[PDB]
Design a protein around this ligand. Structure first.
Ligand SMILES: NC(=O)c1ccc[n+]([C@@H]2O[C@H](COP(=O)([O-])OP(=O)(O)OC[C@H]3O[C@@H](n4cnc5c(N)ncnc54)[C@H](O)[C@@H]3O)[C@@H](O)[C@H]2O)c1
Ligand SMILES: NC(=O)c1ccc[n+]([C@@H]2O[C@H](COP(=O)([O-])OP(=O)(O)OC[C@H]3O[C@@H](n4cnc5c(N)ncnc54)[C@H](O)[C@@H]3O)[C@@H](O)[C@H]2O)c1
Ligand SMILES: NC(=O)c1ccc[n+]([C@@H]2O[C@H](COP(=O)([O-])OP(=O)(O)OC[C@H]3O[C@@H](n4cnc5c(N)ncnc54)[C@H](O)[C@@H]3O)[C@@H](O)[C@H]2O)c1
Ligand SMILES: NC(=O)c1ccc[n+]([C@@H]2O[C@H](COP(=O)([O-])OP(=O)(O)OC[C@H]3O[C@@H](n4cnc5c(N)ncnc54)[C@H](O)[C@@H]3O)[C@@H](O)[C@H]2O)c1
Lengths: 297, 297, 297, 297
C-alpha cells in the first residue's frame, strides 16, 4: 500500500531553504516518486541555488531509501505579482528582480507549460506579513492587505493560472494555522485574517475546481515546526513549548510529519477528500484548557 | 426586563437607505432608547439626506411605540480611506467627494469626538465588492483586495479609531454571512473571503479590545433579508426562496429580527457574550441537506 | 424594547435550590413577566418547598423592580422515568418517592395540562452523572448510560411529552457545556458525551418541532457559575479561576448573565433563532491558548 | 513511501460480511501488511464463517497485488456486553449465543491477549439502533439508549479493555456520520445522538489514551457507501444520489476510499494526527446549499 506518485509532477511554491514546511513537503513527494519543480521567491533565489550547488542541503536531501532528492527545476517567483504590467518600476529596478525573469505568476505558469507541458500537484507554502508582530488594533491597512495578498490571494492566483495545465484527478494543498479559528495572541498583522481567508477559499475552490476540472483542494492546519529551544524566547519557540506541554500527545512536531500528511492528501488514495482542513498538530486544537495553567497544580 | 439603551450613544456605519440591515439595527437601537449617529457612504449622502428631509422614509421610521426614529446626526464616511493622505487626487476631485469633508475614518472619528465626546456602541454594516458576481477562479487580485478592504479591514479601522472614545462596557457588532464557512455558489469576488476574515477578526478584536478597554465584540451571521419574489431571479431572491423552503422553521427573515438580535447583543444584558458568531437565519445553517432536493420526493 | 413575556407560561425542569442556572433562568423569565411553573427532583422536593415557605430564598427572589418572584406551582419530577410502568419497585418504595405522586414525565405533563392547559416555554436545566469524577477510560457502561439518560434523553422526553400542550411560536432552552466539543479533563463519567448528544439533539429537534409546531429550540453553552474561591480546590472552583484568568474579557460569570440570555432566547424578539448553540462564557471558547501558561511570562 | 503495517496486528470490531466499512478497512490494512483479527457479532458468526469457508467472499478478498486477504482469526463478539455477569438469562439461552463463548468485551480481549499477546491497531466499525427509522420525537428511552450503548459506549469499552494490550505508538479508528453535527432527516432513533457522543469521546480518549499509553485516537466521518440505485428508495440509496448530485466533486464513494484513509490514519505516517474528525465524503460536508434545489435552475 504505497503512496504512489511515480509519473506525477509537482510544482511547489514557497521554497527558500531546507528549514520550512515547503522543503518538508517536497521531500515526502519526492520519496513517493514525484518529479519536483520549485518556485523560489526571487530575493532568495541566489542563495538558494548557490547553497544547493555547493552541497549545503545534502544532509537535508536524504530520503528514506538513502537516496538524495532531486529538484528537477527551480523557477523564480514572486506571488504578489500576477503579470508583468503589475510590477512597479520600483521593484523591477531592484538588483534582485533585475537579475532574473518570468517571475510573475502568469509568466512562471507559462514557463512550466512550455517546459513540461503539465503538472499534477500544486503545493502552496508561502506566507508573508510585514506587520506580523503588531496586534490587529495596531495593524495598518497596507500591512493588513499585504498579508492577505501574499498569504491568501497568492493561492487563488497560483491555482487559477496553473489549472489549465493540471491533469484531472490532480490536487493541491496549502498550509494553514489555527489562528484563523481561535485567538492566538502574537500572530498579528492580519496573518490570522489571511489564514481565515485561505481556509474559506479552500472550500470554495474545492467546489470550483472540483466541478471544473476534477481537482481536489485541501489545506493542512499545522502546529509549530521543530524541537524545543534551550530558552524559548520569540513566538515560534514559545508555541513549540506550549504545544509540547499541552497537546493530547506529548511530543514535538517534525517536518516529516507534515510532509507525509501532504503526500497522502495529494495522492490518489485520498480520492474522496476535498475542501478539507486537516489538523497536523498533535491534537492541540482539540484541547479545551491548558494543562500547564497554574490553577491546575 | 427591558433592553435598556437610554443614555447610550451609537455610531452606525453603513446606512444609505431604509432597505438594509443597517437601518434595521438603527431602528431597534432607537426603540431601546439609544441616541443615533449615522455614517453614510459619501456617494450616497445627498440622496439619503434629501429623502430623509422630504419625509420619504417616514413609514420606515416607525418604532413600536408609534413614535418616529430620530437620527441625531449624519456623518459622511468612506471606510476604505483611513486618513486624508490616503486619498487619491483621483477620488478627491470627484463631484461627490468634492461636495463634502471629514469623511476619512480618522476624520469622522475626530468629529464625533468633537461633537459628542463619546459613544457606547459601534455598528458595522458596510460591505462592498466590485467583482461579487465572479467565481473565485475569475476574481482579480485588485477585486479580491477591494472586497477585503471595504468589507473586513474597514471594521478593524473603525474600531481602532473609535476605541479611544468608547466608554468601557460598550460594544460593537458587525454583520456576516455563512459563505465564510460553507460553500455558497454565487457569493463571489472574494466576498466569502472577506466574511471569513471579518469573523476571525471578531474573535481577535474581542480579545484585544476586551482586555484593553472592556469592550465586547460580536458578529451576526444573518440570512437573506426580505419576502419572496414573484419570480426569483438574482442571487438574493433565490436565497430567500431557498431558505424559506429549507430552514428548520418555514418563514421569511425580517429586518426586525436582525435588528432585535443586535440590540440585545450590544446591551448590558449580554455582558457575558463576546467573540461570538450568532446565527440569525431561521436555523438554516444547521441543516445537513436541502429538503427540496428532488431526490427526496 | 422590552423582552416581554407577560401572558406567557414557563415550565422549568431542574430547580432544587436558588444556587443553579435553573433558578437564574426562572428569575429572568419572571422579571420579563412570565408565569412560573417548576419541576423539582422528587428527592429534593421537601427541603425545597420547606425553605421556600420559611422565606429562606427571599433574598434570592428579588427581581430588578424590587418585587419578589412568585413560583405559581412546584411539581415533583423525576426525569429519568417516562411513565409509571417504568418505575422499579425499588424506587417506588423509597420514602421520598413514596411521599409524592405524578412525578413521571408523562404524569407531570398531564398534570400541567389539567392545571393550566398550556405552556409557552420549556426550560431544561437538569443533569446528573453518577461517575462524573472518573475518566472515560474508567467509566462503566451503567454510569455512562445514566448520565446520558438523565442529562440528554430527559430533554427529548420532556419536549416530546410537553409539545402537544405548547402554543405555537413558543420555545425551549437547555444548558450545555464546552466539554462536548473540546477536551476538558475532569468533566468525566460520560457527562461530556451527554452534552454532545444534547447539542446534536437540539439541532434535530429544532427541525422536528419547528416544522411540526413552530417551536424554537436552542441551547446555551455556559461557563462556570460564581465568584472565585479563596482557595480553589475542586473542578468548578478551579474552572472559575481558569476562566477569569484566561477569558477575552476578565471577569466572573453571574447567574443573571445566563438567565438574561435565556430570557431573550425564549422571547419573540429571537424569532429567527433556532437549533443554535449560544456561548455565554465571557468568550473563553474562542481562545486558542491559556494566557497564564508559564511559557508566556 | 509506503504505508507500511508489516509486523503490526489489527483487531477489527464489526465485520459480518463483505459489504460494509469494516470489510473495507480490513482489506486496506491487509494490503498494507497488517495481520488481521476480526470481531464478529455473535448472531452473524455462523453465516459469516460459513461463507468464508465456501469461498463466497473470494472476489471481495482480492487485494491490489492480486493476492487474497487472510483473516488470521475470527472472534465472536457482542459489544453491548462488557462481562459475563452482564448477560441476561434471556440472551445467554438463545440458540446463537448458546453456540459460542467468550463473546463479552472482557472475554474477547482476554482471548486475544492469550492468543497473540498484543495488538497495534483497533478498528471500531459497529453501530446498531433499534429505532433508527423513527424521528427523535418518537424515539423511546430504551431505543435511544440502545443506540448509544451499541454505537458509542461500545467504543469506550473496547478501547478500555484492549488498551493494556496495545503497543505504544499504536492507534484506533472509528466511523462516524455528519448527522452528529448537522440535521439529516431520516437518521433517527438516537443514532445522530450516538454519533455525536462517539465524536466527542474520540477527542477525550485521544487525551486519555495519548497521555496514558501514547495511542492515537481518530474518527472518519464517511459519506454513503456504494453506487447509485436504479430507483433510489430508502435512506441510504437516497443519500447516495443526493451526494452524487451535490458534492463538490461529482462521484460516488467506494469502500476503498474509506479503507485507504483509515490505513493511512492508523499508520506511523500519521504520527501527528489525533482527536481528529476526518471527512471522507467527497467534500459534501463543506457545501452550504444543494445544487439540485429547484430554486436554482
Ligand atoms: N503557525 C503556523 O503553523 C504557520 C504560520 C504561518 C504560515 N505557516 C505556513 O508555513 C509555510 C511557510 O514556510 P515556513 O513557515 O516553514 O518558512 P518560511 O518563512 O520560509 O515560509 C514562507 C515562504 O514563502 C516565501 N515567500 C514569502 N513571500 C513571498 C512572495 N511574495 N512570493 C513568493 N514566495 C514568498 C518565502 O521565501 C518562504 O519560502 C507556508 O505554507 C505557510 O503558509 C504556518
Ligand atoms: N448574505 C448575507 O446575509 C450578506 C451578504 C453581504 C453583506 N451582508 C451585510 O449586510 C450589510 C449591508 O447592508 P445591506 O446588505 O442590507 O445593504 P447595502 O448594500 O446598502 O449594504 C452595504 C452598505 O455599505 C455601504 N458602503 C459600501 N461601500 C462603502 C464604503 N467604501 N464606505 C462606506 N460605506 C460603504 C453602502 O452605502 C451600504 O449602506 C452589511 O452589514 C453587510 O455586512 C450580509
Ligand atoms: N460546565 C458547565 O457549565 C455545566 C456542567 C454541567 C451541567 N450544566 C447545566 O447546569 C444545570 C444544572 O444546574 P446547576 O449545575 O446550576 O445545579 P444542579 O446540580 O442543581 O443542577 C442539576 C439539577 O438537575 C436536577 N436533577 C438531577 N437529577 C435529576 C433527575 N433524575 N430528575 C430531575 N431533576 C434532576 C437537580 O435536582 C438540579 O436541580 C443544567 O442545565 C445543566 O445542564 C453546566
Ligand atoms: N451515514 C453513515 O455514513 C453511517 C451511518 C451509520 C454507521 N456508519 C458506520 O458504518 C459502520 C457499520 O458498517 P456498515 O454500515 O457498512 O454495515 P453494517 O450494518 O453491517 O455495520 C454494523 C456492524 O456492526 C455489527 N454489530 C451490530 N450490533 C452489534 C453488537 N451489539 N455487537 C457487535 N457487533 C454489532 C454488525 O454485525 C455489522 O458488522 C460502522 O463503523 C458505523 O459506525 C456510517
Amino acid at each position: 500500500l504505497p503512496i504512489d506518485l511515480r509519473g506525477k509532477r509537482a510544482f511547489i511554491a514557497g521554497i527558500a531553504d531546507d528549514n520550512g514546511y515547503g522543503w518538508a513537503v517536497a521531500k515526502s513527494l519526492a520519496a513517493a516518486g514525484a518529479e519536483i519543480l520549485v518556485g523560489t521567491w526571487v530575493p532568495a533565489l541566489n542563495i538558494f541555488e548557490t547553497s544547493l550547488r555547493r552541497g549545503k542541503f545534502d544532509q537535508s536531501r536524504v530520503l528514506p531509501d538513502g537516496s538524495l532528492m532531486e529538484i528537477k527545476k527551480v523557477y523564480p517567483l514572486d506571488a504578489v505579482f500576477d503579470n508583468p504590467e503589475d510590477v512597479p518600476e520600483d521593484v523591477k529596478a531592484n538588483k534582485r528582480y533585475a537579475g532574473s525573469s518570468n517571475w510573475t505568476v502568469q509568466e512562471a505558469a507559462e514557463c512550466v507549460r512550455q517546459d513540461f507541458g503539465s503538472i499534477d500537484i500544486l503545493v502552496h507554502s508561502l506566507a508573508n506579513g510585514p506587520e506580523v508582530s503588531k496586534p490587529l488594533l495596531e495593524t495598518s491597512r497596507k500591512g493588513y492587505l499585504a498579508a492577505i495578498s501574499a498569504s491568501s490571494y497568492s493561492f487563488v492566483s497560483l491555482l487559477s493560472h496553473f489549472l489549465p495545465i493540471m491533469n484531472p484527478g490532480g490536487a493541491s494543498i496549502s498550509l494553514t494555522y489555527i489562528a484563523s479559528e481561535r485567538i492566538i495572541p502574537g500572530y498579528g498583522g492580519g496573518m490570522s485574517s489571511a489564514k481565515a481567508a485561505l481556509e474559506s477559499d479552500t472550500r470554495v475552490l474545492a467546489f470550483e475546481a472540483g466541478r471544473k476540472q476534477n481537482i481536489r483542494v485541501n489545506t493542512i492546519s499545522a502546529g509549530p515546526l521543530g524541537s524545543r529551544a534551550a530558552k524559548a524566547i520569540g513566538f515560534i519557540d514559545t508555541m513549540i513549548e506550549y504545544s509540547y506541554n499541552n497537546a493530547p500527545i506529548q511530543k514535538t512536531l517534525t517536518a516529516d510529519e507534515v510532509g507525509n500528511a501532504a503526500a497522502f492528501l495529494v495522492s490518489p488514495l485520498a480520492s474522496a477528500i476535498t475542501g478539507a482542513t486537516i489538523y497536523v498538530d498533535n491534537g492541540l486544537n482539540s484541547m479545551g484548557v491548558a494543562l500547564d495553567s497554574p490553577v491546575f497544580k
